[PDB]
């Protein structure tokens, strides 16, 4: 996948956003912007050019699942890759992510190596 792919990292916790942004940088992905919830995310997505979303599951105003469904049902970004992050792997949340079209699913905290594995699985599936 292109090194200049523009990521949006979504989480209401600034530290986690920084951590994910830093892991992305570690993998060579420098084009990264942040959003603090689903609403803020959708607002920033309007600037256009975004090629990948990483979103936390629980956020105020609009959570991760709500954001994911909105993106998937949106005319312009329905095919955007979306990696969902949760605090715990549960059958219910995994199946909820599957039904909504999550491109990937990962439990935090995760290493750069894990992030890389998840991104690569998504790139492969999408032919990126």
């Amino acid at each position: 996948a292109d090194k200049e792919l523009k990521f949006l990292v979504v989480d209401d916790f600034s530290t986690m956003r920084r951590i994910v942004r830093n892991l992305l940088k570690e993998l060579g992905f420098n084009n990264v912007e942040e959003a603090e919830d689903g609403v803020d995310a959708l607002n920033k997505l309007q600037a256009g050019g975004f090629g990948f979303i990483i979103s936390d599951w629980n956020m105020p105003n609009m959570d991760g699942l709500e954001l994911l469904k909105t993106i998937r049902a949106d005319s312009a970004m329905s095919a955007l890759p979306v990696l969902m992050v949760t605090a715990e792997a549960k059958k219910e949340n995994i199946i909820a992510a599957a039904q909504a079209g999550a491109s990937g699913y990962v439990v935090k905290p995760f290493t750069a190596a894990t992030l890389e594995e998840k991104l690569n699985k998504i790139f492969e599936k999408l032919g990126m």
Partner: peptide, 13 residues
């Protein structure tokens, strides 16, 4: 874990 790990694999996650 078993089903979780299997479920994940099945979904390609």
């Amino acid at each position: 874990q078993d089903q979780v790990d299997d479920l994940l694999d099945s979904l390609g996650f």
